[PDB]
Design a protein around this nucleic acid. Structure first.
Lengths: 46, 46, 93, 50
RNA sequence: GGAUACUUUGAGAGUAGUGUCUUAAGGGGGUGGUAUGUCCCAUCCAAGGCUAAAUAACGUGAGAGACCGAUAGAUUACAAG
RNA sequence: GUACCCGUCUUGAAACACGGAUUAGGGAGUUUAUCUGUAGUGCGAGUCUUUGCACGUUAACUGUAAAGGCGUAGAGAAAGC
RNA sequence: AACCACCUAAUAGCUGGUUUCCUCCGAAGUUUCCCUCAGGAUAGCUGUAAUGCUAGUUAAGGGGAGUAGAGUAUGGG
RNA sequence: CUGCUCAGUGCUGUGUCUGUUAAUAUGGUUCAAGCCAACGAAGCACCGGUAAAUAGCUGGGGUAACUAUGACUCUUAUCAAA
RNA sequence: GUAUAGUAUUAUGCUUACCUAUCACAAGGAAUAGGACUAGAUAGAAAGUUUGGCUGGGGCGGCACACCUUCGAAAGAGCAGCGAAGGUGUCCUAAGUUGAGCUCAGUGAGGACAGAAAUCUCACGUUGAGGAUAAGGCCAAAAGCUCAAUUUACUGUGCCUUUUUGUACUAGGAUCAGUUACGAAAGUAAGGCCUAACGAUCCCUAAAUAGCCUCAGGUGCGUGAGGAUUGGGGUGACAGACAAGUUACCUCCGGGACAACUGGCUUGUGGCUGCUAAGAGAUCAAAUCAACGCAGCUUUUUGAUUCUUCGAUGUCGGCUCUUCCUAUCCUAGUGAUGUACAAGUUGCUAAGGGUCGGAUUGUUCACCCGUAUUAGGGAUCGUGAGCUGGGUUUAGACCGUCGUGAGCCAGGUUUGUUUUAUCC
């Protein structure tokens, strides 16, 4: 037998995320100890 | 697909043949189809 | 077939006929200190499967019944062999 | 597949090229014969030479 | 050193090596080719190191021949790797 | 007058079996180890001188010490004989 | 199940080939055993080396046989 | 518009109550090697779930007022349903 | 690692080990994850390998693969086939051994109930019964049946036959050396009246009142092990590997030692024709049919066979063109008649000429519509470097049954490369 398409996603040549136009990693700011105000500069679509 | 490419492949008439529902213990290459399915079929109620 | 539980028989060591209590012979289970067995144990270890054969195509369902004529004067057994039997009984009469 | 099983055509020819008569060394065969007879036949010979 | 697993040996109830776990003694310990305890006799003292000569030589460089004599002898006798 | 085309496997080839356009030159039972048997040769209850040493007009040839090989006693699993 | 080199002149109970002359002798396709039937081993048939000091026929006497033929025990009719 | 079937083969458990089971450790026994016990996880067995998992799903007689057909009725299939 | 409750081990806290965490945090988890070594469990994820022989080709079927009986087998020995008719993988402490006594199967007559069959009696009774079973021998004061006592179905080594052109094992046979049984005794008994009823090395295992040799420094002391001698555990493919499929995606070696394909031999089957008549034919066997039988011809059907071809004779049908055969449908000429005419049925000579247009089907063949009345064959089933490629027969794909599956299927359906002449 050959190696099956389910197994071939691991080796990860053509099966990688198309991550070029993605604007950044979506997360909070780090914790750093009260209350902190934050203006929404803009809302964008990635 | 033909028998070499995938587990379900091959035969004169297209059909699965083997039970088509496999364990957590089953290997790479072997985990194809419904993995550890404690139920199958139409989920009527519940 | 039926067989007597005592009969007269030539004791090889006493060199004469004398009556002797007969019994069916002990198939011993093999000890692991046997030299042949020891070779097998060491050889079975490692890789490369089972080493020596076992007989898959074994037809016949029969066994030659060896008896054990345990003497009473001599005190020594001397093994007689019958033919091959499907069943073996003691005589009650 | 199916070739011949046997023949005797020219068995006779080969046998007669040479039916040699194998001669016996002596008529007594002391491996056989009665031991009780041969036992006494020793003591006939042993007693005579003395 | 021991148990166990693998490789290895002519080494056979383990010849040698290695993994894992375990781990001594020092008026004592090893070896004596069948496992095991036990009594004698014999013979050596492991777990650190250095050391010429006899020995090897299908690579490279620089006299001999019952060998070949340009389709042979090296792929190459010559502006041949 | 006579005369089928060679080579080949085959029970059987002139075959409508296969190889073969012509010519020259290359082109296939050899050698080693352990043995078998026959014949030749030398010594003979002995025989082999080689691993090696001493020689040399030097890989040869020649000389020679002592082991060792096979033979000289066999049967038996073995003790013992 | 790519290509290149090497292990590798891999193995083949199978196919094809296998180079001078004269001279004397001259087969076998059969027995037993084999995961044996396109192959082996063993005997036979053949050649050679030799070495020691009757019969592949008939007659005469005497054993053996159940074929061809032939024919109210068993069978058929 | 997607009928019926969890018997086999799968897979599976807010499934363990028992039966079978390895090294090891604990216990007995010998002068020692060793031998005899008992113990016991996962897995299997046992008990539930599952078919838009894999699959599976009938044969034959009698029978209505001319004959004909068989609404109706009787019987069998596998450890599931026809 | 550690602190505390409880039954050396369970429970839930601790962080500093360690860990996730982001590479740099800070938290949270926690003596656990994970890793390392060992053990058990898991229907091809992956690897390696196997998947007999015989055979009028192979497959399926069968065992003729080890043994035994009769026949084939040709009156010595020997003799083959998937030749003929069968049998064996056991059964029995008596269905063995010994001694004695008796005679069976059957037929005939009799005898309360008694009948075709119950038990009793006499007479004849060469063995046809019975002797574990296949078949063939063998047997009558027995080898049968009955009664009684018994364990020779015993121990140990050589020898012989089947069988030596192949020595073995199995089975059988004659002894010697023991010892027992039975009989008054001579004797008989080494299983079953005789021919089938079974098996190597290696390894394990049992036999010894607990024996005979060895464990290499001890003529060592317990345990333990190893030997020689005698059986058993088993190989039916029976001189004895341990072993499932599929390939139409296929590869290689070879094979005309072996099939499909033309030819050859053969002619059962197919086709065609005689001889005879037992009657059909109103009457009447022979105008015309022709039984039950018997004898031939043919190679236009299909078998059978394996001689040729597997380092390849391009395989079905149609299209196109040639020639040949006659077992004559028409045309030429003739005879018969249940021949008035006409249309017919039928025999003989004749192969010069004629023998067709279409619908469906790949068709050959068949079957209808229509016409000038209307036969069938051969030539490598004429004819592919003349064509066509519809069919058959590759690789794609679908349906149906079968198979767990890969895959299969004279079951169906669709898409699928047809080369070269300039040589004689």
């Amino acid at each position: 037998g050959h190696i099956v398409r389910a197994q071939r996603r691991g080796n990860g040549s053509v099966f990688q995320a198309h991550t070029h136009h993605r604007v950044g990693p979506a997360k909070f700011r780090a914790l750093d100890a009260s209350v902190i105000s934050g203006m929404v500069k803009e809302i964008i679509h990635d | 697909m033909n028998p070499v490419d995938h587990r379900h492949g091959g035969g004169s008439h297209q059909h699965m043949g083997a039970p088509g529902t496999v364990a957590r213990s089953a290997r790479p290459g072997q985990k194809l189809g419904l993995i550890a399915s404690r139920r199958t079929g139409r989920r009527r109620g519940t | 077939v039926h067989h007597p539980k005592t009969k007269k028989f030539f004791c090889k060591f006493c060199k004469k006929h004398t009556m002797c209590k007969v019994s069916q012979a002990s198939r011993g289970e093999e000890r692991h200190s046997a030299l042949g067995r020891r070779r097998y144990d060491r050889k079975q270890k490692g890789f490369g499967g089972r080493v020596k054969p076992i007989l898959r195509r074994s037809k016949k369902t029969s066994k030659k019944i060896s008896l054990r004529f345990t003497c009473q004067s001599c005190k020594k057994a001397t093994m007689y062999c019958l033919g091959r039997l499907r069943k073996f009984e003691w005589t009650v009469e | 597949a199916k070739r011949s099983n046997t023949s005797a055509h020219n068995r006779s020819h080969q046998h007669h090229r040479n039916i040699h008569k194998c001669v016996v060394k002596k008529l007594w065969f002391e491996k056989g014969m009665n031991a009780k007879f041969l036992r006494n036949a020793r003591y006939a010979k042993a007693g005579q030479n003395k």
